[PDB]
Design an enzyme around this catalytic site. Structure first.
Site, mmCIF file in Angstrom:
data_model
loop_
_atom_site.group_PDB
_atom_site.id
_atom_site.type_symbol
_atom_site.label_atom_id
_atom_site.label_comp_id
_atom_site.label_asym_id
_atom_site.label_seq_id
_atom_site.Cartn_x
_atom_site.Cartn_y
_atom_site.Cartn_z
ATOM 1 N N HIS A 96 -5.862 5.150 0.663
ATOM 2 C CA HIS A 96 -5.156 6.343 1.140
ATOM 3 C C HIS A 96 -6.052 7.587 1.113
ATOM 4 O O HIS A 96 -5.624 8.659 0.674
ATOM 5 C CB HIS A 96 -3.891 6.569 0.304
ATOM 6 C CG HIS A 96 -2.802 7.302 1.022
ATOM 7 N ND1 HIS A 96 -1.547 6.765 1.207
ATOM 8 C CD2 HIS A 96 -2.772 8.533 1.587
ATOM 9 C CE1 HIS A 96 -0.791 7.631 1.859
ATOM 10 N NE2 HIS A 96 -1.512 8.711 2.103
ATOM 11 N N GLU A 112 3.552 0.314 -3.002
ATOM 12 C CA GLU A 112 3.014 1.452 -3.740
ATOM 13 C C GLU A 112 1.778 1.055 -4.540
ATOM 14 O O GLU A 112 1.499 -0.131 -4.722
ATOM 15 C CB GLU A 112 4.077 2.038 -4.671
ATOM 16 C CG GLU A 112 5.008 3.036 -3.999
ATOM 17 C CD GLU A 112 5.814 2.415 -2.876
ATOM 18 O OE1 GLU A 112 6.570 1.457 -3.143
ATOM 19 O OE2 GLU A 112 5.694 2.886 -1.726
ATOM 20 N N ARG A 135 0.913 6.121 8.522
ATOM 21 C CA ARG A 135 1.716 5.714 7.374
ATOM 22 C C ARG A 135 1.802 4.195 7.272
ATOM 23 O O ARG A 135 1.520 3.482 8.236
ATOM 24 C CB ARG A 135 3.120 6.315 7.463
ATOM 25 C CG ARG A 135 3.307 7.581 6.642
ATOM 26 C CD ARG A 135 2.233 8.609 6.961
ATOM 27 N NE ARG A 135 2.098 9.606 5.904
ATOM 28 C CZ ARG A 135 0.951 10.186 5.565
ATOM 29 N NH1 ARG A 135 -0.168 9.869 6.203
ATOM 30 N NH2 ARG A 135 0.922 11.082 4.589
#
Length: 337
Positions: free
Chosen positions: A295, A275, A246
Site C-alpha cells: 500500500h 487487512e 483500492r
C-alpha cells in the site's frame, strides 16, 4: 451544542504522529492521537468530545461507529480515497467529511508505471530470482530465466477510471509506445479528445481489447469486485493486471485462480483488500507471477508532508471558519444536516 468547550479536541484516529500537523493546529486545537485500529480502541473521552477527526486508511468508519461520536463536526481523511468511510450516513449525522485529492497524484502514477514496466520487463522477478540463487550464464538461459519479457510498443494499455491518476498514467504510457485506451463512466464526454485518448463505452470492451489492464477507480457500491469470475474471463489470454487503486475492486479468489491457470500472465498489486497481511494468508498463496507492494504507491516523504499540512489546514478552516463553507475539500456536501 454538546458537552464542553475550551479549545476544541481533534483526534488522529488510526495514527500516533502529529508532528507535521502540530504547528498548524497548535493554537486552535487540542492535539491527541488514538493510534486505534478500530472504534473500540478509541478511548471514551474521544468519542464523547472529539470535535474534529483526522484519519488515514487503517480504520473503517460505519454508521455504527459514527453514531457513537457525540460532538463530532468534521472527519478529515489524510489522502485521496474515503471508501473507508460511510460518507452518506456521516453527513446524515451532520459530520462533514473531506479529503486530500492531489498530494500523491504523480507518486501514484509513477509506481503504476513502475508496476506496468515490472511485469513487461520482469525486472523485479528477475532480481528476486538472482537473490534466490538462480544462476544465469548463457544467452539461452537469459532468454529462459527472463522468459516472456515483452516488447511494449503496440501493446494496448486499458485504463479503468480516468479521474486523477488515470490521466497521469495515460500520458506517461504514451511515451512508451503503449496503445492507450480507457473506460470511465462518470467522466464527461470530450475529455478523451482534449487528452487524445481512445475511450470505450462498456467495461468488457476495455477488458476485451487491452493487453494490460490498470485500475484507478474510486471504491463504492457498484464497482466492488469489478474483477471476478465473469469479468476476468472477458480479459485476454495472458493479459497483465495492475491495481494500485483500492483492494475491494478485485476478487482475489478469482484472480489467484486465474493466475495459476495461466489466463492472466501476471499481476502487480499495491492493494490487496484483506487487512494488513497477505502472501502467507489469503487466496494469493503461491500465486505465480504476482508482484506485491504494501500500500505504498502514494508514499514519498515530500507528498506525506504535503498532504498532512493540507489535511491540517482543512481541520483549521473547519474549527475557526464555518461548515461547510470554509472547507476546501469537502466530499459530502450533498448529504449534510
Amino acid at each position: 451544542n454538546g458537552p464542553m468547550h475550551p479549545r476544541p479536541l481533534v483526534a488522529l484516529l488510526d495514527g500516533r504522529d502529529c508532528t507535521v500537523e502540530m504547528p498548524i493546529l497548535k493554537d486552535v486545537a487540542t492535539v491527541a492521537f488514538c493510534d486505534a485500529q478500530s472504534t473500540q480502541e478509541i478511548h471514551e473521552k474521544v468519542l464523547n468530545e472529539a470535535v474534529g477527526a483526522l484519519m488515514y486508511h487503517t480504520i473503517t468508519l460505519t454508521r455504527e461507529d459514527l453514531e457513537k461520536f457525540k460532538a463530532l463536526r468534521i472527519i478529515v481523511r489524510i489522502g485521496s480515497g474515503f471508501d473507508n468511510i460511510d460518507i452518506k450516513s456521516a453527513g446524515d449525522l451532520g459530520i462533514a467529511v473531506c479529503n486530500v485529492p492531489a498530494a500523491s497524484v504523480e507518486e501514484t502514477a509513477d509506481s503504476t508505471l513502475c508496476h506496468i514496466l515490472n511485469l513487461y520487463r520482469r525486472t523485479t522477478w528477475l532480481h528476486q530470482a538472482l537473490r534466490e540463487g538462480t544462476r544465469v550464464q548463457s544467452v539461452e538461459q537469459i532468454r529462459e530465466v527472463a522468459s516472456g519479457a515483452a516488447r511494449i510498443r503496440g501493446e494496448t494499455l486499458g485504463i479503468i477510471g480516468l479521474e486523477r491518476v488515470g490521466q497521469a498514467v495515460a500520458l506517461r504510457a504514451k511515451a512508451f509506445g503503449f496503445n492507450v485506451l480507457f473506460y470511465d463512466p462518470y467522466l464527461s464526454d470530450g475529455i478523451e479528445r482534449a487528452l487524445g485518448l481512445q475511450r470505450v463505452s462498456t467495461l468488457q470492451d476495455l477488458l476485451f481489447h487491452s493487453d494490460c489492464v490498470t485500475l484507478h477507480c474510486g471504491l463504492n457500491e457498484h464497482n466492488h469486485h469489478l474483477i471476478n469470475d465473469f469479468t476476468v474471463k472477458q480479459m485476454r489470454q495472458g493479459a497483465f493486471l495492475v491495481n494500485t487503486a483500492r483492494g475491494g475492486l478485485v476478487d482475489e479468489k478469482a484472480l489467484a485462480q486465474a493466475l495459476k491457470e495461466g489466463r492472466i500472465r501476471g499481476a502487480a498489486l499495491d492493494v490487496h483488500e484483506s487487512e494488513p497481511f497477505s502472501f502467507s494468508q489469503g487466496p494469493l498463496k503461491d500465486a505465480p507471477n504476482l508482484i506485491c507492494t504494501p500500500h505504498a504507491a502514494w508514499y514519498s516523504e515530500q507528498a506525506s508532508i504535503e498532504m498532512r499540512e493540507e489535511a491540517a489546514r482543512e481541520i483549521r478552516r473547519a474549527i475557526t471558519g464555518r461548515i461547510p463553507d470554509s472547507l476546501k475539500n469537502c466530499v459530502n456536501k450533498d448529504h449534510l444536516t
